């Protein structure tokens, strides 16, 4: 029901630590978990490729 | 986590007890 | 050869995922301990002066 | 045919196990939060009344 | 966004997932998780939260006015079965292998049922099989009827396609899942499945059995459902759980896609023939009912500028001899009632210890016999132990007594007989528990009207509904031992049991006494008069009346929405007795509309007063 | 043996449902009974009526 | 491959030990910290009782 | 009491055909058959330390009125609770202590030790997890049931009757919950020789299913499980136990998912802690009498 | 057949790896589901304490009154 | 062959398929919460 | 027409228009993350 809130917290909380601005319409944000991970993983993948 | 929690939460009793003792 | 990379893959399949997830667990646990301390502090200090004054 | 049989058993067992873990991720978290959400959410009602307490207490403090 | 939720509209095991709608537009339904089907009807516009006890995969609408919709079960049979008047009027068992495509071309009436080995055509009026396209190794993936009149289109497991005109090439996709639909005009064939295509052939087969593999835009990877909409639109439910409405004229030109917050995606959908309303069902079982035209127009216009023994022998015996003596009664009734003699189940209801709910009986039943009331306590208590709703409703001794007095010389028999009495005969008797089974008795009251719609017309005019229900119930609580005769009543039970095949007769017989007296009921205004009147020892002539009631039963069509329509629940299980739903939790609506307004007033008044006593701060 | 191992994986995915099935009762029953305990907060509302009575 | 499977079952058995003994020791540490947090209560509470008297 | 001249071998058949005991003398039949490692040491330790904050069946969700059950059950729960925290809080372990004192208890030591021995031989997999009931046994039972007439399952699964759903009344909800007082009839005295099984209680649980397929095959909706179950109908017990036993003899371990250990929890120097217990998810019940006492006091002062 | 075999052999050898890791994966995902279940149970313990806080609130009002009376 | 055709992916593409709705709610936190703050604060003419 | 970037990125969802102000950051983060990622694999 509100699991999503457990992560709305966690995700608005962490996307903002990366200083992103957030100007949109509203719709249940329990999802960036994987985009933070994808950008971070790509960025890490990048660092790993760089190291390679 | 829960133990340190429980402990610091438990000691709030001691403060309550101080009030109860006072009266 | 790939069998060797594959046994090696247990480490390259990222043992460090454990370290990472564990780090996240150790981390979040501390983050939430701080949140607890905050809520516990709200309660722990909110008292007593009236009773001692009275 | 034995290899294809074994291979299909593994192919679909492995494919579905994983597809299921994903279907279940949605369902398992819902098993907790579907209800816990309301318990903690509705209990805001107690937090809400702290305001009434503030006023009654001061009425009484001053009385 | 009109929303239908069945968890309130007959709380039970739902999570509705597949919607279906009829061509008259007043007939609706949905397949729930258990394979159970819930239908819905307009005309009375009554919620009709009544289900169909099937284990289905496919509900297909039938033009019959009360539907008796065709349902493909898990055992691959087709049940022709409604809720309106209930009645599984035909069990059209025939097919084996899951029927995957069930549909009817109601232009003439023509039922197609596709299994992987055989596509068959059934003639609806009898549901006879007229044609069998049994084709070796086709392993039909699907097929459908072209409504134009008429073609059967065959689509093989291997992706091959061919058409069969009803008077007698390929896609190439080896789909595991395949879904086919045909345009209203019968000019397009649209196929979707596991792959990302809006596969269009024409019917109008300028392509032969070739299809255009239009890849759907962006979000479709594969689909879950296909349906042609309104005119030339085609709507797909993608695997992304979103619905895209495309226009054949412009290929895609998607006109609409909008699902309410995406946190609740769509599991399935269907269109009312009056295309203005489309209903889509969410993955959580929510039916989003909405104006479809308005919704396309909204997203499309909004975004526009963006860039001896034997029942027969017994029926005559019990009519010509009349009744039947005790030493042999157990044989005749065990036979007629299909009783299991589940003596182990009964004996262990009987011995546990104390039964506190009926210790006690003389206060309502002061019969001065300390062994007979005991017999009543023992059966009665076994019944409540079996199902505690029977003590809620502690009225039960009302009939437990005359049967324990009679049949209950044999306790195991009497108990099982009673379960038959409650399990198949008195099916609605517990649905308004703890109160009288009123709506429920409406099946009965309507039956009073059905047998004599002058009598019921005057009863409602003269006795103001509630008390008649109480009058009828107390007659049905015993039953006719008080009504008619203390000992000659028995004819009707031997009659009903001879006719245990026809559970409706419990109600046809109490009706029949109302219909016996006719003009002698008409002047009555209260239950206290009718109760004692029917309990007067008037001469009946029950051998005529019973047997006439049997005909009355056999004189009407099964189109009657008799609240609780009875089913044959007569045979009981062995080892342990059957699980039976002797429970209420139904809404009467109007009194809650009233309670709701009252509570809103009570609480705003409370708050205005609590608020007004800001004065208390100022004062104290 | 491959089947035994496939079987063990299959058996474990059923256990996965058992966790969800258990939660479907453990959550639900504790939650309703401790919704019943929330009426003790209604009986905390009681004190406002009492304090107001004391004030009035 | 016969040889390599020998080596990479051996590595596997080694990793079984390394991973589970590493974790075992990590839990011994957390365990003592938590347990000590419990034992210090009882160490303190001896005086808490004395303090409660006055 | 400790003069074991009669072999348990004589009892193995007696216990089946003449059932098991005088209700007032079974204590000396039962312990000979279960094996209680009694000595002078641990119970006293468990008795001396003790109680309390976990006690939900004492004036929380359940009352006790009878002092042989009150003052006395406090000892069994205290012991078991502090012997192993899992008993102290777990619902399905609490439910064994509840009848052991009700049924024995007078007999304080024995109700306790009987609970521990039982827990070691039977309840070893009745935990699996906690708060959870034994998820693994809900699965182990479907495996034995599939062997013992799989059509029931095909049908139940077809309508989404899964684990727990039709199993729990006797399995996971604890084995006394679905049977009445004089019907499970101290089943623990009855399956005492079949504790040496995986467990026979598994076979029996399966036997409260399957033989009940006639009504279970009538379940179309889960709505009906509640109807079916809440009656807590013992059916027979006797012929369920017997079919369970014969199933043991004809069910090779090859058909059993959960393995049970050969536990004979005896030591003259020690008592085994139940080890399968989620120590981390326990030791949290409440009582909190002051929660309501304060209203009384408030009113008195306000009055 | 020795040629088609190359494809069959490489696929079983890798399919086996799907399993080699799935055996590790299920244990990991089961862990995550389980830990999420544990977190509730421990949250509930904290919710018991939440109720204690309301008990404290009533106790506080009682003291305000008894101390004044 | 692709024994690795699944799982690792479950911690990948959801990223933005799903961040697209994230893009709508973790926003209230900075913009609507700001919207009405600056607009209701229009009182400060 | 912001949809198109998502479609190429294949980040499937019904879209708002009515969304520029954030798509413009986060998808550029995806397009470019570290573009060197694409170039490094080639290097």
Automatic annotation (TrEMBL), chain A:
Compartments where located: Cytoplasm, Cytoskeleton, Microtubule organizing center, Centrosome, Centriole
Annotated organism of origin: Tetrahymena thermophila (strain SB210)
Family indicated by similarity: Belongs to the CEP135/TSGA10 family.
Lineage: Eukaryota, Sar, Alveolata, Ciliophora, Intramacronucleata
Name of the protein in its database record: Centrosomal protein, putative
Automatic annotation (TrEMBL), chain E:
An individual GO BP term: cilium assembly
Superkingdom of source: Eukaryota
Occurrences of domain Rab-GAP TBC (ranges): 323-500
Main localization of the protein described in the UniProt heading: other
GO CC list: centrosome; ciliary basal body
Location(s), subcellular: Cell projection, Cilium; Cytoplasm, Cytoskeleton, Microtubule organizing center, Centrosome
Entry keywords, A to Z: Cell projection, Coiled coil, Cytoplasm, Cytoskeleton, Repeat, WD repeat
Identification of the protein by name: Rab-GAP TBC domain-containing protein
Origin species: Tetrahymena thermophila (strain SB210)
TrEMBL record, chain F:
Protein name: TBC1 domain family member 31
Interval of the full protein contained in this chain: 723 to 778 of 1202
Biological role: Molecular adapter which is involved in cilium biogenesis. Part of a functional complex including OFD1 a centriolar protein involved in cilium assembly. Could regulate the cAMP-dependent phosphorylation of OFD1, and its subsequent ubiquitination by PJA2 which ultimately leads to its proteasomal degradation.
Sequence intervals crossing the membrane: none
Subcellular location: Cytoplasm, Cytoskeleton, Cilium basal body; Cytoplasm, Cytoskeleton, Microtubule organizing center, Centrosome, Centriolar satellite
Phylogenetic lineage: Eukaryota, Sar, Alveolata, Ciliophora, Intramacronucleata
From TrEMBL, chain I:
Subcellular location as annotated: Cytoplasm, Cytoskeleton, Cilium basal body; Cytoplasm, Cytoskeleton, Microtubule organizing center, Centrosome, Centriolar satellite
Primary role: Molecular adapter which is involved in cilium biogenesis. Part of a functional complex including OFD1 a centriolar protein involved in cilium assembly. Could regulate the cAMP-dependent phosphorylation of OFD1, and its subsequent ubiquitination by PJA2 which ultimately leads to its proteasomal degradation.
Protein name stated in the entry: TBC1 domain family member 31
Species in which this protein is naturally found: Tetrahymena thermophila (strain SB210)
Covered residues, full protein: 819 to 887 of 1202
């Amino acid at each position: 029901s509100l699991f999503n809130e457990r992560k709305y917290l966690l995700l608005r909380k962490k996307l903002d630590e990366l200083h992103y601005t957030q100007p949109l319409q509203i719709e249940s944000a329990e999802l960036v978990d994987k985009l933070l991970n994808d950008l971070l993983k790509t960025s890490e993948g990048f660092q790993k490729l760089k190291n390679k | 986590k829960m133990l340190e929690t429980e402990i610091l939460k438990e000691q709030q009793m001691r403060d309550i007890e101080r009030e109860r003792k006072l009266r | 050869q790939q069998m060797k990379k594959l046994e090696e893959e247990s480490r390259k399949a990222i043992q460090i995922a454990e370290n990472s997830r564990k780090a996240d667990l150790d981390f979040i646990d501390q983050e939430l301990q701080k949140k607890r301390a905050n809520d516990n502090k709200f309660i722990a200090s909110k008292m007593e002066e009236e009773a001692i004054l009275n | 045919s034995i290899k294809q049989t074994r291979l299909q058993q593994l192919n679909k067992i492995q494919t579905l196990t994983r597809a299921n873990l994903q279907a279940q991720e949605e369902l398992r978290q819902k098993e907790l939060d579907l209800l816990e959400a309301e318990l903690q959410y509705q209990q805001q009602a107690d937090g809400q009344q702290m305001q009434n307490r503030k006023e009654e207490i001061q009425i009484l403090e001053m009385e | 966004c009109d929303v239908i939720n069945f968890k309130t509209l007959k709380k039970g095991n739902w999570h509705s997932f597949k919607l279906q709608f009829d061509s008259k537009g007043a007939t609706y339904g949905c397949l729930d998780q258990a394979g159970n089907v819930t239908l819905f009807y307009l005309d009375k516009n009554r919620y009709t939260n009544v289900d169909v006890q099937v284990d289905s995969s496919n509900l297909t609408f039938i033009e019959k006015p009360t539907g008796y919709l065709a349902v493909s079960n898990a055992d691959c049979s087709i049940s022709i079965y409604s809720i309106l008047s209930g009645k599984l009027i035909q069990q059209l068992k025939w097919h084996t292998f899951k029927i995957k495509k069930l549909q009817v071309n109601h232009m003439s009436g023509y039922l197609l049922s596709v299994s992987s080995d055989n596509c068959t055509i059934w003639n609806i009026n009898t549901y006879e099989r007229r044609k069998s396209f049994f084709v070796k190794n086709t392993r039909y993936a699907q097929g459908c009827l072209t409504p134009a009149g008429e073609h059967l289109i065959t689509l093989s497991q291997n992706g091959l396609v061919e058409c069969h005109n009803t008077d007698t090439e390929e896609i190439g996709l080896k789909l595991k899942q395949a879904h086919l639909d045909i345009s209203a005009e019968g000019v397009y064939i649209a196929i979707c499945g596991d792959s990302n295509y809006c596969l269009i052939g024409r019917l109008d087969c300028q392509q032969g059995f070739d299809f255009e593999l239009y890849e759907l835009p962006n979000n479709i990877q594969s689909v879950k459902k296909i349906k042609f909409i309104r005119n030339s639109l085609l709507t797909l439910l993608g695997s992304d759980e979103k619905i895209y409405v495309l226009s054949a004229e412009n290929n895609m030109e998607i006109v609409l896609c909008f699902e309410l917050p995406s946190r609740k995606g769509i599991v399935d959908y269907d269109l009312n023939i009056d295309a203005k309303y489309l209903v889509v069902i969410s993955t959580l079982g929510e039916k989003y009912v909405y104006d479809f035209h308005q919704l396309i127009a909204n997203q499309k216009k909004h975004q526009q500028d963006v860039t001896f023994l034997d029942r027969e022998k017994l029926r005559e015996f019990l009519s010509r001899f009349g009744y039947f003596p005790e030493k042999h009664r157990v044989v005749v009734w065990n036979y007629l009632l299909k009783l299991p003699s589940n003596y182990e189940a009964f004996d262990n209801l009987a011995r546990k210890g104390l039964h506190p709910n009926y210790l006690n009986l003389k206060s309502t039943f002061p019969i001065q016999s300390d062994k007979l009331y005991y017999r009543t306590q023992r059966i009665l208590s076994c019944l409540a132990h079996y199902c505690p709703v029977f003590a809620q409703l502690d009225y039960m001794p009302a009939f437990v007594f005359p049967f324990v007095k009679l049949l209950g010389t044999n306790e195991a028999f009497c108990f099982e007989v009673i379960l038959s009495f409650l399990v198949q005969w008195g099916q609605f008797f517990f649905e308004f528990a703890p109160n009288p089974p009123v709506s429920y008795l409406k099946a009965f009251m309507e039956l009073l009207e059905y047998h004599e719609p002058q009598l019921h017309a005057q009863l409602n005019q003269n006795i103001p509904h509630t008390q008649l229900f109480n009058t009828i119930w107390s007659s049905l609580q015993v039953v006719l031992t008080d009504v008619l005769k203390r000992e000659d009543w028995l004819c009707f039970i031997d009659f009903l049991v001879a006719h245990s095949e026809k559970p409706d007769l419990l109600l046809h017989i109490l009706v029949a006494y109302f219909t016996y007296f006719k003009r002698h009921i008409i002047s009555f205004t209260t239950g206290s008069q009718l109760l004692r009147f029917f309990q007067q020892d008037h001469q009946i002539r029950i051998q005529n009346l019973l047997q006439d009631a049997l005909e009355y039963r056999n004189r009407t069509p099964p189109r009657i929405p008799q609240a609780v329509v009875l089913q044959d629940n007569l045979p009981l299980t062995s080892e342990q007795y059957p699980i039976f739903n002797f429970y209420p939790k139904f809404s009467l609506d109007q009194h809650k509309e009233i309670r709701e307004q009252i509570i809103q007033e009570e609480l705003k008044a409370t708050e205005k007063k609590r608020t007004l006593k800001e004065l208390n701060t100022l004062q104290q | 043996q491959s089947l035994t191992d496939q079987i063990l994986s299959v058996e474990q995915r059923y256990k996965e449902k058992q966790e969800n099935l258990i939660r479907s009762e453990q959550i639900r029953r504790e939650e309703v009974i401790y919704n019943a305990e929330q009426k003790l907060s209604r009986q905390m509302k009681l004190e406002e009526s009492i304090k107001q009575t004391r004030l009035q | 491959e016969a040889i390599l499977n020998l080596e990479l079952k051996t590595a596997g058995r080694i990793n079984e030990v390394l991973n589970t003994k590493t974790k075992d020791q990590n839990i011994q540490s957390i365990t003592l910290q938590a347990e000590i947090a419990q034992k210090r209560l009882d160490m303190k509470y001896k005086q808490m009782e004395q303090q409660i008297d006055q | 009491n400790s003069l074991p001249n009669m072999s348990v071998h004589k009892l193995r058949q007696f216990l089946q055909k003449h059932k098991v005991y005088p209700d007032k003398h079974r204590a000396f039949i039962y312990k000979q058959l279960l094996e209680l490692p009694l000595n002078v040491d641990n119970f006293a330790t468990l008795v001396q330390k003790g109680l309390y904050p976990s006690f939900k069946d004492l004036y929380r969700k359940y009352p006790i009125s009878d002092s042989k059950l009150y003052q006395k059950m406090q000892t069994i729960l205290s012991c078991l609770a502090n012997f192993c925290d899992l008993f102290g809080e777990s619902d399905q372990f609490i439910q064994i202590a509840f009848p052991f004192v009700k049924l024995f208890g007078q007999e304080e030591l024995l109700a306790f030790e009987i609970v521990l021995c039982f827990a070691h031989q039977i309840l070893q997999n009745y935990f699996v997890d906690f708060p959870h009931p034994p998820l693994d046994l809900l699965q182990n039972i479907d495996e034995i049931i599939k062997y013992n007439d799989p059509i029931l399952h095909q049908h139940l699964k077809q309508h989404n009757f899964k684990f727990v759903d039709y199993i729990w009344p006797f399995l996971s909800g604890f084995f006394t919950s679905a049977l009445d007082k004089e019907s499970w009839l101290q089943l623990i005295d009855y399956l005492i020789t079949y504790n040496d099984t995986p467990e026979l209680f598994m076979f029996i649980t399966a036997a409260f299913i399957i033989y009940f397929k006639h009504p279970l095959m009538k379940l179309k909706s889960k709505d009906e499980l509640e109807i079916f179950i809440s009656r807590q109908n013992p059916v027979s017990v006797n012929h369920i136990i017997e079919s369970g036993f014969s199933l043991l003899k004809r069910t090779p371990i090859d058909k059993i998912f959960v393995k049970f250990s050969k536990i004979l929890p005896l030591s003259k120097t020690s008592y085994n802690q139940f080890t399968n217990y989620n120590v981390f998810n326990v030791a949290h019940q409440e009582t909190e009498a002051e929660a309501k006492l304060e209203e009384s006091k408030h009113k008195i002062r306000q009055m | 057949q020795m040629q088609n075999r190359k494809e069959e052999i490489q696929i079983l050898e890798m399919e086996a790896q799907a399993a080699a890791r799935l055996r590790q994966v299920m244990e990991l995902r089961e862990k995550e589901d389980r830990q999420r279940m544990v977190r509730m149970d421990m949250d509930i313990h904290r919710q018991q304490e939440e109720d204690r806080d309301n008990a404290l609130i009533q106790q506080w009002r009682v003291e305000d009154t008894e101390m004044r009376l | 062959q692709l024994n690795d055709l699944e799982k690792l992916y479950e911690e990948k593409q959801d990223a933005l398929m799903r961040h697209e709705r994230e893009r709508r709610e973790i926003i209230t936190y900075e913009q609507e919460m700001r919207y009405s703050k600056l607009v209701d604060a229009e009182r400060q003419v």
